[PDB]
Amino acid sequence: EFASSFGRPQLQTLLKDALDQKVLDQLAARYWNRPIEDLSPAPREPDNIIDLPKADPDSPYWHRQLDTACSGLTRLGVGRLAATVAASAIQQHVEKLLD
Amino acid sequence: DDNMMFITKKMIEIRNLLQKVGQGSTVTLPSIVVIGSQSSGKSSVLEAIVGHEFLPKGSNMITRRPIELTLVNDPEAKVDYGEFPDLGLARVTDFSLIQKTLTELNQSVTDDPIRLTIHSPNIPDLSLIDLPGYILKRKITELCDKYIRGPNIILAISAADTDLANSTALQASRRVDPRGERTIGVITKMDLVEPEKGAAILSDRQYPLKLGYVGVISKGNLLASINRNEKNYFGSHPTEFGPDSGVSTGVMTLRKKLLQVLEQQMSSKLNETTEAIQRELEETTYQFKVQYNEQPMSAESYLAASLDDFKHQFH
């Protein structure tokens, strides 16, 4: 009965959420600020996200940063992420059915 | 079990490339550090030589600079040959020449540690560094201590004549590693002691650690022979140190343990280290845009554009 119940759009939302969190992973690691200790920061400093809207297009923290962000997101173990997420979903539903 | 040696060799090559990247490549992978007191320091040199093959060592060593040994599985290679990275592209057949060269580096004496690379089929790939052992003396200690602090798989050798407590090697091993988790012990010069003697040393509870201690006597076809003697000697008092006995000894078991520890610890450091490289790649990439518009450039393309401008002016 469960196998007739499960199907695919369940997988849909499941993979779309985990790839969101990976989107949050990329954006932060490539664009945003970092932890704080008394140690002073990297400068950086052309990498200010704020002057992003009213900037000239050929600026990297724009162009190159987005470019490497997408190359990094696609060339990540999305194959292995879908595998393990579908794995932990099916495993869960079999443990719910066992209860 | 080939896949096995291999993980280590891939990591060792990666350790070298981090070591070489550049100025802010503060980043690196750990490795074996080797410390020993004087009698013990002599035992340690002997041991390093013995682990693979004879090499120039001991005699008179200023011990001022560390020697980074990086080894390579040499199956399909039939010649025992060691090469220097700064002396790039040079291969050395007889280790006597390697004696002359590294020991004149020894008399020259910055603090930089010479890198080395040796290929031999009996040797399993490793990555140990030999710093000067304890005996000016303060300054040697200072370098020793600094190297031991960081999470390298350290440790120690100790001659059987000295009390374990008395030896600085294990004593600093304990100083920088209270838990004894990241440090392995070796009891050298074990040939001239009773088997009661190996038993109390090879296995002790006054100073327990993970990875245990390893007792061995180190000192053509020298490899195999040193192997022959280890296989032969324990027969003198087999029950005191042999199979199913709690102690472990001889060079081969000590080596495979070295393989395991090195594969495990390095593998732990790989994550933090890798996120570090992704951060420095992103810094280099962003500077690549702000500076020179990320376009590829060669020296010839630069040279062509000027030459061209000059000819039309001259015309």
Curated annotation (Swiss-Prot), chain B:
GTP binds at S39, G41, K42, S43, S44, G58, K189, D191, S218. Residues 26-271 form the Dynamin-type G domain. It is found in: Mitochondrion intermembrane space. Residues 36-43 are annotated as: G1 motif. Residues 217-219 are annotated as: G5 motif. Residues 188-191 are annotated as: G4 motif. Mg(2+) binds at S43, T63, D130. Residues 130-133 are annotated as: G3 motif. Residues 62-64 are annotated as: G2 motif. It comes from the Eukaryota. Constitutes the soluble short form (S-MGM1) generated by cleavage by PCP1, which plays a central role in mitochondrial inner membrane fusion and cristae morphology. The transmembrane long form (L-MGM1) and the S-MGM1 form higher-order helical assemblies that coordinate the fusion of mitochondrial inner membranes. Inner membrane-anchored L-MGM1 molecules initiate membrane remodeling by recruiting soluble S-MGM1 to rapidly polymerize into a flexible cylindrical scaffold encaging the mitochondrial inner membrane. This is Dynamin-like GTPase MGM1, small form. The gene is MGM1. The chain holds residues 224 to 566 of 939 of the full protein.
